[PDB]
Design a protein around this nucleic acid. Sequence first.
RNA 1: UACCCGCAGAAGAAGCACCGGCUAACUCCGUGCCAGCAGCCGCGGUAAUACGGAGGGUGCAAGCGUUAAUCGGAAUUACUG
Lengths: 205, 341, 32
Amino acid sequence: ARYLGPKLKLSRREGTDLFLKSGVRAIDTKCKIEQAPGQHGARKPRLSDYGVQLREKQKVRRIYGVLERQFRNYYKEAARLKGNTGENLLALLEGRLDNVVYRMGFGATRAEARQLVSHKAIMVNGRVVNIASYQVSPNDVVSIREKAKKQSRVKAALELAEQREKPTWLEVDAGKMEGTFKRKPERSDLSADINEHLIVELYSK
Amino acid sequence: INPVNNRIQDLTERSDVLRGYLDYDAKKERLEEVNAELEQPDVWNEPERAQALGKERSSLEAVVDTLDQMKQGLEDVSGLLELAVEADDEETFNEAVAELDALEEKLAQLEFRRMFSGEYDSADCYLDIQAGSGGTEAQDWASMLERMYLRWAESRGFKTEIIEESEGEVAGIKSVTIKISGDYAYGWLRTETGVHRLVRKSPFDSGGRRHTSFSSAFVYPEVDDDIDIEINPADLRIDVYRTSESAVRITHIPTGIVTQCQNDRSQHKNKDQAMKQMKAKLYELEMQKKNAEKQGSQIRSYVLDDSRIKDLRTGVETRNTQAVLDGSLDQFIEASLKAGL
Amino acid sequence: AIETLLHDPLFRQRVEKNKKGKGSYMRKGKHG
RNA sequence: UACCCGCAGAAGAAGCACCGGCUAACUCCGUGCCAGCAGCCGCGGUAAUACGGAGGGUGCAAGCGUUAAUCGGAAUUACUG
Ligand SMILES: [Mg+2]
Ligand SMILES: [Mg+2]
Ligand SMILES: [Mg+2]
Ligand SMILES: [Mg+2]
Ligand SMILES: [Mg+2]
Ligand SMILES: [Mg+2]
Ligand SMILES: [Mg+2]
Ligand SMILES: [Mg+2]
Ligand SMILES: [Mg+2]
Ligand SMILES: [Mg+2]
């Protein structure tokens, strides 16, 4: 139920930086980010129509740390919901508790955030929530609980975040270690490189 | 002296090889238990069983005993040689040089004995080469095979004779029976029964395509006047046909296998020959059956394009294809014998 | 039963298909 | 009983299919129309990305493949068409 293997390999495969590592050390220094993995890395075969879409799908899934069935379910949900499908899907993905935590800056990485969530560190409206797939609604305060507040990792994560670009759709306090999910993000708030449309297309063949 | 020196070690090596082939430990073990049994006095009360046991023991001892002798004899020889070297005397040296020969000879004899296990290995035999389905090419292949075999026979010192030949209209032969004659012929040739895969580019074809043909050889020993079983007169059919009046074909109904003869001038002679052949064939089939009870058909692949011959079952390859064709197949046969298929 | 053994399809004269000559033409290669 | 609190220590917890095209993923070795593969087209006859093994990858994941069976694709019974 999780990808436990090499993280930078995935990134390499994708092409881009997936932010699967903390962002202390630049991704180029840790790995040959340009060259794809394995023995046949330097060769770059011309990718098919299906294939590109698939790759795109993988990228998004990889980024958030979501396996396939769950992803499919999410997609379905998005489709069901009113409005643009890809956008909806993206929103749903964002809404995940672990993702939210990561955004806030309590986990260096999304994986870290997920771990924290698992290990009963994250209260959501004062009630300990353990499920990484939990959807954080608007006006849901989400905080570190007092036991995990002392952890040196959390502060490091926060620091890292502070270097990173801040999301408009949250509001987080470094001292209090508690953040309010103000609103579900508009597509413009998220990364432009994600071609949600491709993903949508893929799940219609 | 150098040759002598060479001979000491070589002999030893061959003895070692022989021992390995034998798998002597098992034999020794068998002898031991058997010996123990013999020692127990209750075995001789039942006579036949006792006799059987005795029979079993002696051979076991003898093979093993022979091996022991070889081991020991060789050692003795070595010692003698050493002595000679130490004490500069001619006579001793001469003795050392000489005594070894006998042992070697004995070893050779033993090996020969081991090789020819079957009862009819000593007798002369009937090679039978029948061409493939293909067409002209198959016939040609068959002919080639026949030629090879005859050359081999010649090399050996075997008296060959064509009992029957049927010719292919364009070229080659449809089929051919050959009587080989000489000491231990069947012992060599019995291995070479089976199908032979020729693979070459067909000159008989207009294009330069690469064809794959087959031909069976089938070898059976001559067993006339010794064996008790005889063909039932009702099952035996005689048949006459023209030479290429004289020739005679014989047919057996239960088994459904035939044998013919056209070499003799009158009918009577031919018929007799056919009968002789037929009985031999029957004997062979019976023995085969027995073997099976006790207990794909392609034996060799001659690939003339890539220039390699490879006996399938043994797993011995050679590139001197031409040589092999010319009757230098001894190597394969000996390997086969060693294998004991 | 030797003649029957020789007869079996197993031992029917194969002929290798051409690559450059008469039956040369392949519509689609082994790989794209 | 759910639930909660404490204890210890990364500790007890990853496989299955696939990588000729369709179809995401390629190389070396062995064999050599054999052994075998195969859903279709087909592959294999001594440089096999198609067989078997390895390394490498891809896809799913406490499951993964195969078989069966139904609709779909099939506008291939067409009312829509
Ligand atoms: Mg599950
Ligand atoms: Mg929708
Ligand atoms: Mg592909
Ligand atoms: Mg397979
Ligand atoms: Mg090779
Ligand atoms: Mg090869
Ligand atoms: Mg080839
Ligand atoms: Mg392969
Ligand atoms: Mg159907
Ligand atoms: Mg219909």
